[PDB]
Amino acid sequence: MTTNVALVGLARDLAARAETGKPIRIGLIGAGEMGTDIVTQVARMQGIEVGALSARRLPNTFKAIRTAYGDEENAREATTESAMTRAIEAGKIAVTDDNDLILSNPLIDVIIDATGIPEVGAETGIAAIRNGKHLVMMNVEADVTIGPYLKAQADKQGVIYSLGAGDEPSSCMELIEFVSALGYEVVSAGKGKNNPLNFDATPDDYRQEADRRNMNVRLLVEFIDGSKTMVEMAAIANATGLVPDIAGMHGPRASIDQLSHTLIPQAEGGVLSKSGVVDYSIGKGVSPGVFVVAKMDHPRLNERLEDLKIGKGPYFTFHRPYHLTSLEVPLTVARVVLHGKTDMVPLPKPVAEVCAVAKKDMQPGEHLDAIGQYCYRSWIMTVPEARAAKAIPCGLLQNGTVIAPIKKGELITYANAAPQPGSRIAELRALQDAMLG
Amino acid sequence: TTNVALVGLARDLAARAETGKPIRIGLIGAGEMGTDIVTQVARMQGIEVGALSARRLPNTFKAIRTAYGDEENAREATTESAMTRAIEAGKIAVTDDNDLILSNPLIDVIIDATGIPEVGAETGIAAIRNGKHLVMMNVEADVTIGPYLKAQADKQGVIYSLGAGDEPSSCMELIEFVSALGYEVVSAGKGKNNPLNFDATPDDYRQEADRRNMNVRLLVEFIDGSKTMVEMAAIANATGLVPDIAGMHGPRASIDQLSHTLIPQAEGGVLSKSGVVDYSIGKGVSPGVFVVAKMDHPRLNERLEDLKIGKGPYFTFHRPYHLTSLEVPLTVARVVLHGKTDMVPLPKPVAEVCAVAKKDMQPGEHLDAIGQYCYRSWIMTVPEARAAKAIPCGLLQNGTVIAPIKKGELITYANAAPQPGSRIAELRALQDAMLGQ
Numbered sequence: 061m062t063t064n065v066a067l068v069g070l071a072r073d074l075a076a077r078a079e080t081g082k083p084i085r086i087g088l089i090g091a092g093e094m095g096t097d098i099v100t101q102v103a104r105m106q107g108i109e110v111g112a113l114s115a116r117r118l119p120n121t122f123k124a125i126r127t128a129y130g131d132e133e134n135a136r137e138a139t140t141e142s143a144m145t146r147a148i149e150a151g152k153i154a155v156t157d158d159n160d161l162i163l164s165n166p167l168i169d170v171i172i173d174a175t176g177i178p179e180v181g182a183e184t185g186i187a188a189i190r191n192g193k194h195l196v197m198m199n200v201e202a203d204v205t206i207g208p209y210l211k212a213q214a215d216k217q218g219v220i221y222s223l224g225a226g227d228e229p230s231s232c233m234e235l236i237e238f239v240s241a242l243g244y245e246v247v248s249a250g251k252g253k254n255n256p257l258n259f260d261a262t263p264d265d266y267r268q269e270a271d272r273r274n275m276n277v278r279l280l281v282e283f284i285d286g287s288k289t290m291v292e293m294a295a296i297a298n299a300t301g302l303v304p305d306i307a308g309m310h311g312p313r314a315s316i317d318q319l320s321h322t323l324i325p326q327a328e329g330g331v332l333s334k335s336g337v338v339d340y341s342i343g344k345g346v347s348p349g350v351f352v353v354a355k356m357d358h359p360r361l362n363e364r365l366e367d368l369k370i371g372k373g374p375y376f377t378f379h380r381p382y383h384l385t386s387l388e389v390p391l392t393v394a395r396v397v398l399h400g401k402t403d404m405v406p407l408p409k410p411v412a413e414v415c416a417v418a419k420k421d422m423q424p425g426e427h428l429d430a431i432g433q434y435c436y437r438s439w440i441m442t443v444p445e446a447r448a449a450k451a452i453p454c455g456l457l458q459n460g461t462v463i464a465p466i467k468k469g470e471l472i473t474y475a476n477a478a479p480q481p482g483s484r485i486a487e488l489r490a491l492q493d494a495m496l497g
Numbered sequence: 498t499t500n501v502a503l504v505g506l507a508r509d510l511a512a513r514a515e516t517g518k519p520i521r522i523g524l525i526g527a528g529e530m531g532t533d534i535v536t537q538v539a540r541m542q543g544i545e546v547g548a549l550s551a552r553r554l555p556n557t558f559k560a561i562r563t564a565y566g567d568e569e570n571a572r573e574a575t576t577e578s579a580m581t582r583a584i585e586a587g588k589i590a591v592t593d594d595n596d597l598i599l600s601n602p603l604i605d606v607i608i609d610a611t612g613i614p615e616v617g618a619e620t621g622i623a624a625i626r627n628g629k630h631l632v633m634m635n636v637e638a639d640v641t642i643g644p645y646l647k648a649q650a651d652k653q654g655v656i657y658s659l660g661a662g663d664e665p666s667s668c669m670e671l672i673e674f675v676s677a678l679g680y681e682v683v684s685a686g687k688g689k690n691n692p693l694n695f696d697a698t699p700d701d702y703r704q705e706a707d708r709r710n711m712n713v714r715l716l717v718e719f720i721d722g723s724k725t726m727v728e729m730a731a732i733a734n735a736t737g738l739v740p741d742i743a744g745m746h747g748p749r750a751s752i753d754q755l756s757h758t759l760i761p762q763a764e765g766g767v768l769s770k771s772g773v774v775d776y777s778i779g780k781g782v783s784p785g786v787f788v789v790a791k792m793d794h795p796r797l798n799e800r801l802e803d804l805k806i807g808k809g810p811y812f813t814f815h816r817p818y819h820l821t822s823l824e825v826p827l828t829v830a831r832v833v834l835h836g837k838t839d840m841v842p843l844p845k846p847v848a849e850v851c852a853v854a855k856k857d858m859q860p861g862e863h864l865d866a867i868g869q870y871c872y873r874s875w876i877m878t879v880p881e882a883r884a885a886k887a888i889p890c891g892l893l894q895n896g897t898v899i900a901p902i903k904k905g906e907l908i909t910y911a912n913a914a915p916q917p918g919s920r921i922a923e924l925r926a927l928q929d930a931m932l933g934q
């Protein structure tokens with residue numbers, strides 16, 4: 061009709077949900093780019109709606125709705141529960157500047173924080189779970205810091221925790237599930253980037269592109285300096301047991317057609333010390349999307365994949381050549397609510413830690429700024445290596461205090477820096493560490 | 498073996514293994530596809546081949562020896578009590594009598610891997626009659642009598658599905674995704690590296706078939722387009738997409754050109770309308786399958802452009818692999834564990850696989866078989882096939898020519914008569930009666 065095709069699978073399940081007259085209802089925190097994308101995407105779908113939308117400043121909620129629909133007719137201001145419930149019952153998106161109204165409204169099935177602020181994702185995440193709501197996490201920086209604790213609390217409450225679909229970590233998990241259900245060895249998994257990283261990048265280098273693209277300069281810097289890649293790969297590690305092969309990963313030069321001879325063991329001509337890793341490639345054809353390199357262990361299976369022109373064995377590349385970011389998150393919401401399935405959760409025992417390296421020399425008393433700025437960049441390590449070094453989890457570091465001189469390129473540790481101790485995020489991480497100890 | 502924690506369907510299969518009662522497949526046909534399935538299941542958890550049949554008993558032992566290295570796991574059974582005792586002993590029961598498999602109480606799901614459409618029809622209705630789920634690999638049979646099989650499965654309370662891993666069922670994965678997200682499916686299908694040759698015969702391929710120890714008919718039906726017509730018809734008949742013209746356009750297009758080619762003429766492509774099955778000639782599409790989708794909101798167009806998915810409003814979604822028989826056990830797992838089909842025909846077919854003569858023939862000659870000398874498949878809409886009195890291609894093997902036929906001419910009830918006594922002609926008449934109601 062709009063789609064040109066009969067209803068099948070999840071599309072059919074959503075249509076059946078719509079026919080009940082009670083759609084799945086998202087409580088959406090954050091009316092910026094990702095939130096506006098979600099509102100826009102849900103408007104094309106059946107059986108799923110945004111019940112309520114919050115922003116720090118109320119006008120930005122109306123702006124998001126106007127961008128999605130071309131006018132504000134679907135928006136209705138609500139600053140108490142009775143007003144929010146009435147709005148939703150009237151078929152409106154309740155808009156508010158009070159997150160707690162969304163977190164506690166009885167008609168909201170699932171919470172998504174789209175602010176892009178890890179501390180807010182932590183705060184609203186534990187609130188969602190305490191209110192007995194399912195939680196879909198888009199903030200990967202938060203997830204790699206406190207995900208295991210959120211997941212444990214979600215299980216204590218009988219709700220589902222999941223990373224949202226459409227970002228490299230969760231998209232890669234689709235490939236991992238497929239290869240592993242078939243009983244094949246996962247040799248390496250990850251993402252690519254078209255151009256080399258620049259670990260020295262700062263907002264001075266990108267402020268011009270940011271202005272031109274009307275976007276947050278920090279998103280550019282964390283892209284170029286490797287930080288986002290380190291985070292995303294750690295999320296895959298911590299959901300699978302795959303490990304970085306070396307701190308920071310290898311990040312070799314490899315096009316899509318070269319992965320199966322590069323991100324494999326050194327004994328077989330690759331760069332890896334062992335099989336079972338997260339890594340990434342620099343080169344053409346991989347981004348957007350994600351990959352798994354799998355090994356065949358039976359000569360007949362090798363021959364079938366060679367006859368099918370999948371590669372030359374025993375290593376083969378499985379590529380998902382797209383990820384739609386925000387746009388796929390409603391699919392996670394549907395799977396959670398209709399099927400009781402998560403798309404991606406951390407394991408109970410993390411295997412990797414996102415650590416941080418200084419981008420510049422700093423003296424005691426200076427404050428560390430923020431990811432995507434001037435002072436530091438993320439750096440993946442195994443948990444044992446991070447612990448030996450007393451590395452501070454990168455997610456804790458914004459506005460931290462330097463307590464001993466730090467040189468450009470040096471690891472940020474509990475010997476040379478101190479997080480702001482009063483954050484929900486440092487306080488939740490302490491609880492996670494106690495749970496794990 | 499996999500290097501990763503159990504997630505999703507893998508986890509579901511491991512939990513099934515822990516019950517001590519695996520999913521049990523009854524496998525009919527010990528040739529190449531059936532040997533692939535025995536080999537693939539051997540590296541999976543929670544799923545086993547309970548029994549294997551062949552026309553000639555020694556081929557069952559040969560399949561098992563190719564899978565395992567020796568024939569140890571095989572045990573001949575000639576009665577139900579022997580078969581059940583063999584399965585309970587951890588053996589693969591082997592026989593030359595399909596009915597022993599079809600009626601054994603320990604068998605959960607039947608798969609016919611013989612590659613013979615008539616046998617797929619016969620064993621499929623028998624599997625349903627016996628209250629077993631049915632996974633169909635024979636697409637030639639499915640596009641002939643699939644609707645009837647699906648209706649009879651519904652009456653018995655069992656599940657009918659095409660097996661995963663072939664172009665039609667792989668494409669349905671993409672169609673599900675795009676349509677769940679509410680996007681317009683413009684075109685869907687597969688690719689071929691080189692131009693079709695409609696005049697190909699076994700003489701052109703017998704040398705390569707001998708060299709590769711393979712059936713020459715598989716090569717001829719690939720080259721002459723027959724398999725492509727069948728696979729696109731299966732997608733059509735599961736979705737309501739239609740060939741835009743008899744035989745489809747089959748334009749030259751690489752993977753990067755699909756989104757400007759298999760789109761409407763008004764927008765610079767070749768199609769008369771949106772919502773089709775078609776195929777491309779050129780690089781980078783094969784192996785696997787595509788959907789070209791259209792965006793209907795400028796923000797969603799912008800997002801996909803920013804992600805470098807394409808230049809809008811048309812975008813290509815590619816699954817760059819499909820593993821043939823190796824994925825079929827995933828269909829078995831989803832059917833038995835989750836009650837989900839991977840692919841079913843709609844109740845009302847929209848496309849018919851018809852046939853065209855490859856050479857002049859005179860009355861009294863017999864038509865031979867697909868992949869040989871006399872005829873090739875040719876997709877048509879159902880209304881055009883009806884109007885022309887076209888015979889469904891699946892009925893034609895060993896049919897009688899009853900009026901002169903020229904090279905390139907459609908095979909119709911006016912110029913040929915199918916063998917009337919086949920299970921496939923009989924079941925097709927039943928389907929036509931059911932559709933008349």
Ligand SMILES: [Mg+2]
Pocket residue numbers: 227228292
């Ligand atoms: Mg990402």
Ligand SMILES: [Mg+2]
Pocket residue numbers: 663664728
């Ligand atoms: Mg095929």
